[PDB]
Amino acid sequence: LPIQTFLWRQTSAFLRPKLGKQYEASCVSFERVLVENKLHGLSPALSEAIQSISRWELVQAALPHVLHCTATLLSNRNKLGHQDKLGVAETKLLHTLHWMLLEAPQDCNNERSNDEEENNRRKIFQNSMATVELFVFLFAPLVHRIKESDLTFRLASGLVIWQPMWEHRQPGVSGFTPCQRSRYATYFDVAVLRCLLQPHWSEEGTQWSLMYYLQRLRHMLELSVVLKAVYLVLNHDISSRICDVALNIVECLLQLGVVPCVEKNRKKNHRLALTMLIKIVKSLGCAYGCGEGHRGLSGDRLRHQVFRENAQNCLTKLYKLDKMQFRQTMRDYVNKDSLNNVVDFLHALLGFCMEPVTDNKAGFGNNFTTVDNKSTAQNVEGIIVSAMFKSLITRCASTTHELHSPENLGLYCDIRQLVQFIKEAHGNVFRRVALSALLDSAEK
Amino acid sequence: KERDKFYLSRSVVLELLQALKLKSPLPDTNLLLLVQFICADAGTKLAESTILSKQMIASVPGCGTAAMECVRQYINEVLDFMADMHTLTKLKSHMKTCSQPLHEDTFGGHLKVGLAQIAAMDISRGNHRDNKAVIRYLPWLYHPPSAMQQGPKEFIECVSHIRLLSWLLLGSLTHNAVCPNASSPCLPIPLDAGSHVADHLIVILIGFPEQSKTSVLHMCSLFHAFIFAQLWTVYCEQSAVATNLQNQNEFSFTAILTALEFWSRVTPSILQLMAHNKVMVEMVCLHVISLMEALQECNSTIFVKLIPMWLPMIQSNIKHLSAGLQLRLQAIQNHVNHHSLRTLPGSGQSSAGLAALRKWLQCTQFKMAQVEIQSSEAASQFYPL
């Protein structure tokens, strides 16, 4: 109760729709009791209740309070403007955090050696798995907020915790610590499972998690919940440098060999990667620049390096895994998305608003007999348009009362080229779905 | 013409006001069918009832049928029906003209929520930005009962106030389960008054040493109002990342701050009563264990931010609990440690999460019917005058 009233008063003011004048008067009373154990100036009930518990129990009671204090201060530091030069009170608060996490195992056995110290640190970290759950819950959007210049030299004792927040190696805290034992969940794996769910991410934290994924695959080969955690930071406002390493990590994740084989299970992880690819190619602008998306220098240079040889390379390596269910995935893509985003994605892929600068004899696949060709179907444009045309025609046939009205008039120009492109560059599947009814009722 | 543009939204509601006052000759198969009309105007459906079979409500649409400005003037009989406690034992004392015995107790909850779902729509047009709705009829939300004035008249005022707010929250929770396509943001308890809705429980908290052993309602006041904190948590979950306004993350941040100020205004007096006596550790943490079990059932992101702000303070005197409460506390803590791996939202898990949430909503709404009917019946036993 007494420490749980003092720290409750020092914590409840931060947990408020408005933050008063107590944001500077609270971090003075945090390095008082925790950093150098000064009990003066405060309530004597705290001085009564501190000597009834251990020195570790004060840390165990005070860690989520100042943790929610630091989380509510770093979420407010974006607006007040201390993104490069840190204030004194937040410096003191992060010094309290790096005392009670790093220097508290030092003096916890000094105020009251390899195996006996291991048992002593196990007794220290008995109920630590509920508090390191909150340690990775209240710093995941706040990784790049503390700049290296904003990281003060009063925090130089706590470098060994936060310098692994940019490369994601194994740090020097016991709550973050041979191929089969990597599949056994340690404290580190469950901590990084409890970490990746937050919003408000950017280049440095996502690059931190991606370098962790690179190091973990290098440790493994030399599960869809982490795919959904990557999906939570790959449906947000995506940039160029992050989708670079994201396309490299889907390159490294498709080759694991956990492929859904539909030809070898009949005798007794793919769709989310496809929508990450689709959102990356859509959000990187159109392949000639007309349409929505990121525009500028970073929007233009990643369609001839990263769409062309990191996204299309991923789809060409993905088509060499299965041959059946990609049509179902792209069919579900057609009936999930509206008209203008499909126009943007197929302008990013085919480039249909400009006319086909080819000749008038684009009919090299234009027969029923030549379905065995592997020129454009092994390319990405032909296989994507083959998997979307058989559902987009049923879409526009069920939405006939939406397109032939002139209010889509400029977009009515776009499809005036687009299916024409599927007439020109993709005459194989054009002729195939042109007379697929004979395959539907007369191939019996 | 206006007498005719709202014609059949007026002829039926004159018998609705006298059916909710319990005087019309009408069966429960046809009683909720009249409330179906005022619910069919805004594209909405009511709660799942067991007195209604699966072939009666299979042909009702949700078209705009001119019944939106006919209930904002008859919204005061909704608060008249849900405000007093005595009507729920009067439900099973007038509607006994049917031979269906298994479907009696649960409609004691199904008629309060069948109005409170309707009262979650016209208030929202008053409570979009400025809150002109609740300040005209029941303005006690902005004027809370303070911390140091707790008396018995103030107790029977404030527990009726919080029963009004919890039944309106159940109505909005039924409004966001089967029909979550309303563009009007359902705000019965707005977050700007969230510093005052936390003050509505401080009266029951410190008044609970002195206003408990009068009747059974006084005793389970902590069970009538600590389900309300769970309802506030799931309402903050439904409104924080909601798709009604332009801002999606900072509204979620101030909703998290408002939920944290509510929890840090309701929790230290619970812990004060825990530190007072050790039989109070059983009697109070029965409600604390049941509300965190409902939090495990709902699995809200507000609950995981309060996991280490309760369990190191509660497990410091874990040995002074009762018999079943220790096993329940250890089971909930082991389910937390198991579901620490399972605490991450996605894009398809929330569909089954909300299916479990609406099945749990029907189950604990039947349980609120049982709790309120038992409390009113044994309180009329305690007050046989």
Author numbering:
A (entry chain A): 20 to 131, 166 to 230, 320 to 364, 653 to 698, 785 to 960
B (entry chain B): 2251 to 2635
Structure paper excerpt:
NALCN regulates the resting membrane potential by mediating the Na+ leak current in neurons, and it functions as a channelosome in complex with FAM155A, UNC79, and UNC80. Dysfunction of the NALCN channelosome causes a broad range of neurological and developmental diseases called NALCN channelopathies in humans. Here we report an overall architecture of the human NALCN channelosome.
After the affinity columns, the eluted NALCNGFP–FAM155A–UNC79FLAG–UNC80 complex was further stabilized by BS3 cross-linking before the size-exclusion chromatography. UNC79 and UNC80 form a heterodimeric supercoiled assembly that sits beneath NALCN near the voltage-sensing domain II (VSDII) side. The interacting segments of the II–III linker mainly includes a loop (L1) and two helices (H1 and H2).
